[PDB]
Amino acid sequence: CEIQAGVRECQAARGLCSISVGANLTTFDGAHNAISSPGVYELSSRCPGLQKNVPWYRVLADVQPCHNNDKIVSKVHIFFQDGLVTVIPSKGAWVNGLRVDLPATVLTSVSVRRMPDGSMLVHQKAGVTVWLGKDGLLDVMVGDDLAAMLCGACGNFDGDQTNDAYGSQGKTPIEKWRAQDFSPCSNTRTR
Amino acid sequence: LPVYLAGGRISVINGGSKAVLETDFGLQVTYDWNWRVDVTLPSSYHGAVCGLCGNMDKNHQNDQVFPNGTMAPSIPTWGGSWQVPGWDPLCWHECQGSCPTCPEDRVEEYEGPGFCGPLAPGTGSPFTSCHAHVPPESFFKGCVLDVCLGGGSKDILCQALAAYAAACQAAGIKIEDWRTQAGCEITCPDNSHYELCGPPCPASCPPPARHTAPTVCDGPCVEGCQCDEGFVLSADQCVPLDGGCGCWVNGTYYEAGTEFWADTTCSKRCHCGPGGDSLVCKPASCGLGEECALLPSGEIGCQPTSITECQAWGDPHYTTLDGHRFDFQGTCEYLLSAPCHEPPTGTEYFNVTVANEHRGSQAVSYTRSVTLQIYGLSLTLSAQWPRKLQVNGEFVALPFHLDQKLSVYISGADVVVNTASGVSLAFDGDSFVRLRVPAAYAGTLCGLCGNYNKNPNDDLTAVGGKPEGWKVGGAPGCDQCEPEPCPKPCTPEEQEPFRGPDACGIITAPEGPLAPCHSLVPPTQYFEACLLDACQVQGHPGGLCPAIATYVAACQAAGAQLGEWRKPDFCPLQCPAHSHYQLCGDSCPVSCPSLSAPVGCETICREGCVCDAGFVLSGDTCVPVGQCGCLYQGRYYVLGATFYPGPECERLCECGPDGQVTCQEGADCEPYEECRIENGVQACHPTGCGHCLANGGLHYVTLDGRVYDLHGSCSYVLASVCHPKPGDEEFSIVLEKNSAGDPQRVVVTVAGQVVGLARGPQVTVDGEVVTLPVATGHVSVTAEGRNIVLQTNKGMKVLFDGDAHILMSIPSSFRGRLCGLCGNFNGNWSDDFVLPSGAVAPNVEAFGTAWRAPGSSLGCGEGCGPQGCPVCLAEETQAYEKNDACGKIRDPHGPFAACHKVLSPLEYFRQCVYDMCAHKGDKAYLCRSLAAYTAACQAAGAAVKPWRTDSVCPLQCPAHSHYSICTRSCQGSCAALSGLTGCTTRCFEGCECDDHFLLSHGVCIPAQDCGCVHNGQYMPVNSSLMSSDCSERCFCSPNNGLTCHEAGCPSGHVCEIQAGVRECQAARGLCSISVGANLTTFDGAHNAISSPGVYELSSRCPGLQKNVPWYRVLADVQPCHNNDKIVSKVHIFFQDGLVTVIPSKGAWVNGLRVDLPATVLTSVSVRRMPDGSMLVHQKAGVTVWLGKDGLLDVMVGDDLAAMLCGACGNFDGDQTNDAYGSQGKTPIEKWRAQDFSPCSNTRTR
Ligand SMILES: *[C@@H]1O[C@H](CO)[C@@H](O)[C@H](O)[C@H]1NC(C)=O
């Protein structure tokens, strides 16, 4: 929902990173790659060195077996500069570890709502907005203003496929983008 | 810029931003002024060439070869084999010491966009065409390696980018704009036309207008700024066409007028004035004992022939410039090296002043400070603040440079000032001032160092035999040494066993490490002064160090090799953090402009302590590399500093992160303060001061006027801030009469810090840790003899005699806002008597029943038996001798004081006669009244014949102490630091210990103690002090002082003040997670987790409304090390974010890595144990210890009783509820939080 041609309605936007339709990641520029392994992987972040008023946003997606081991997105941790917002399609929404009512505004300018179908939408003013589908399909939408500013798994917004797919990395950017904070150690488990 | 030697066609002609040399045989050498070099050969001597970069044989592999002709396996030795023949002191080919390799974790930030971004081979990056022209992989490694090793400043970033851009542009390929998108642009002067392509060899002004065209002048284009439009680019800048255009005599280019001496012999001035194109030449010279020579800058000029040195020893011992040694003692401020008259011929005054101070025993003077006035500017250096610079009454950062003069910088331990003239001053504190005076001055000098006419006998003859004639200013009582006339001169015989090697023996003829200086400088005259110091103070390292250190420094000045002279046992040296000792090192350490001073440097290796892996910032603190502050109008300001560049408090400018000077507009402040320069800071400071006197035990005085006699017997809030102010310091004053008027357990709370001052017996301020003999910080406490003085950072002060007498002096800007028992700040006592609700209670006892301080025990009784105790009312009518007793003491003919003339004694006379008649007489009441008034006169120093004469009142001292009504106990005592205000500008009653003595919190030691004086407090011998945040030990030892090795507390304990002393002890809150995978709850309970996953452990669950912040700890019980279910990470959900800690990696706050030893969020301390465990603490909250091996303990203060509810259960103390919280079995599964728990719902489905 963004004002277009002087009238307010919802229309297609340039920023579009869909996570796993059939477990395939379509980056900002057109790219394809299977996650191929369960776990939480970072997807986008306004990585430093640019100094723009866009707030530090760090989305993560727990790709987990969940419904019939189809690797659908189960929960969407969003690390806003002033806290962590966690959303799950089945249960409610958690802000800093506290349950909140679904139709409310939380943190700084963060709108959270539940679709009548059951999908959950979160939007940031002049920032990212995430649509988490009821069936477990996530779309990340970014305004056209952010051109080659965010850098993450979805890649830059420059419009070049070669850099977007591989960010100076030979293969498997997913494993490189696996954040260790929420990732279990699992180090020498069988040892 | 242009020069044509024409011998073989040697033409150095340069572009806008280059420096190009050209010869006949095509040597193309250019050099950018900031580390960019180019050397090009036109196949000249293709067969071979000796150099660091290739033999030009067309084979890269064969280049790695020694000059001898053999190959080299190692590049370090090979590179070092091509060095220039010459003397090379302190030249290391490689970093022999531990080199700070940049961490591998942060390379990602330096590699992404915004840092070496376009340099990466990306199609969308600017100048992507050059990727095909030149392979940038080598350039890519260099950019990240440079920035990661460096501090991360953007300067090196765009410097590397510009280097790559120019290198790839020289191939002739067009380059698109990059500076704007990268954020780093050039603020070129004049026209400043930043052209991506700009014509090289831009138009200049040929002096004779006849030259050939250089080959390099015809070629490809170059990026940069040109201002040739309008003004022509000539004379190394942009000049209007009718400029100087050189002097064009013999083809040499002398732009404008530089007053350059033509001949090398300096005999002719010959200033080339562009107006007439002629030489204004004078055949004269400077004369005056100075002759011209080739200056290091390159321009020849006058220079003094010889330099003479006058040094002032440490006790003092003064030598003369001619060479006369004498020694005196004094304390009045004197002059030093004052020119008799202003030098008539082009030379300024250089007079210096020196003050003297008493430390330790009497008849001992140390140099307090030195103030120098030169070229209309006055700057001072003092020992009280080391390694800091003060100029014209305000503090400035050390790297202070004036134009061609007054270049102040830090050299080793010393701070050195030097100017255009030969006069130079070096000061190190601890009584050593060195003044280098050029011979160019007159032979007559009216200075304390003496006239330098080269005659020792005539030195100090006009001043007389007494060296105290050169006196100026000074204290009102400097000349009067002591009530006993000038006591205790040391034994001239100096009968000491201190002639042995151990003390004052290494200075002269010990062989060993100090032998080599004997031939250089005679050590006898230096040796003699050490024994006097050993005499006055016996074997104390504090007095012994300065003499031998002065000898070492004076030795090092002449080139010499000195061995290891100081040892941990024998005069150890201390230094602030991030600093290590060095016997002799770099004379000129670097400052924020990362280079040494332009003056001669590294010529002497100097004793002192220097930083490591960090550069000296603002003359202290050894700040981490890459974080310099800002430079503003010639003044250096630390990053984050708030200051007013102009006077009158106009603009509050802030030192920005990347050196930006962020400035806004100030409001000139409330019209109660004035923007004044005091304490080295220009700011609005309060101008008014009031007083609140709680004279006696029960009697009070309002802030203004009538006294409200109150006979209450409970805790009452005297003064507190009633109307909050956005900017101010709060302070609550309470007088807790212990029982029916007992001496008050006074407590003060300033800036949220509780300073006790309560234990009036002796002197025992306790704040939080009762062992505070002498302490500073937010609050400074000074033992003014019997009295105790408390001072704030903002001027608020309060004096307590220790016997229930309080004198508060409040000067702070609280006009009107402040309210309480003292009253509001205004004209009448009626305003003071207003109540918060406006209901005036006629009974003064009712007043204060609302202003009652908490902490009363089982209530309190407010009133005498018969209220007002009228017994004394009737007795005084017939007891006219009772009023005759006190009054005659304070009547005008009775010379008790001179302050009763200044301040009428009527209030204290009434207090004396109103004291309990049944207790009245010459009793403790009368003695206390006299003592209280004579200790209240201390506010303004006045002559005060003693309040006690002979046997009339009783007073004594522990031992070895004499009584004197005029005593300055704040200095000349145990401590080596002073929190005095000139003893609050008062010499007072008390005990002054005699002969060899110290004053450790009342007790007197015969000068064998007080060697341990830390920054915080006085550490007595054989004692220890554990500082904040479990700073384990700062142990004091008799043999060695301040061996402050620090460590951490073991598991199962918390650092909390116990029994009046701060250390770490066991605490009631203890929930250990999985020793052998078993959870021990707050109350004693056992249960195995039995399943991997994250489980909540504690939370201040709602329904209680206590100020304890919402804390929600979680523990990822995971297989991890050998599937032993140890705790792997500890998420802590504080009310303002999530803090994640992992023993292996670092700490994350809101998803950002942070340095391990830092404070984050709201009052959350995070630290890493030296063993490797990680500890996190919350103020008045939970603290978690995560073991290195994966064992977690949760500690909660005893205050939280049955408030938190979680897996560990309540703190009620009942096991049955703690184990199961109304739950039949497995509370762990019930406590599994779903937020971080994976769904895993129907995975196998
Ligand atoms: C899988 O990737 C391919 C790429 O062509 C495409 O079909 C789609 O983006 C992804 N999903 C499915 C169901 O194919």
Ligand SMILES: *[C@@H]1O[C@H](CO)[C@@H](O)[C@H](O)[C@H]1NC(C)=O
């Ligand atoms: C030349 O000098 C290098 C470095 O000192 C040495 O290693 C090499 O053996 C020398 N070669 C000859 C032939 O002297």
Ligand SMILES: *[C@@H]1O[C@H](CO)[C@@H](O)[C@H](O)[C@H]1NC(C)=O
């Ligand atoms: C040193 O020179 C300054 C210059 O103003 C002068 O004020 C001061 O009095 C001089 N010092 C002495 C001791 O005369």
Ligand SMILES: *[C@@H]1O[C@H](CO)[C@@H](O)[C@H](O)[C@H]1NC(C)=O
């Ligand atoms: C103080 O006295 C003056 C003089 O009468 C009066 O005007 C003023 O109101 C008094 N102060 C207060 C707070 O009433």
Ligand SMILES: *[C@@H]1O[C@H](CO)[C@@H](O)[C@H](O)[C@H]1NC(C)=O
């Ligand atoms: C400190 O060291 C030992 C500890 O008992 C003792 O012999 C010595 O006298 C102590 N120092 C002082 C000044 O008491």
Ligand SMILES: *[C@@H]1O[C@H](CO)[C@@H](O)[C@H](O)[C@H]1NC(C)=O
């Ligand atoms: C296991 O629980 C038992 C309870 O008695 C006790 O030994 C201990 O608290 C736990 N750990 C081990 C290693 O036994």
Ligand SMILES: [Ca+2]
């Ligand atoms: Ca791209």
Ligand SMILES: [Ca+2]
């Ligand atoms: Ca070669």
Ligand SMILES: [Ca+2]
């Ligand atoms: Ca003389």
Ligand SMILES: [Ca+2]
């Ligand atoms: Ca008043």
Ligand SMILES: [Ca+2]
């Ligand atoms: Ca319990």
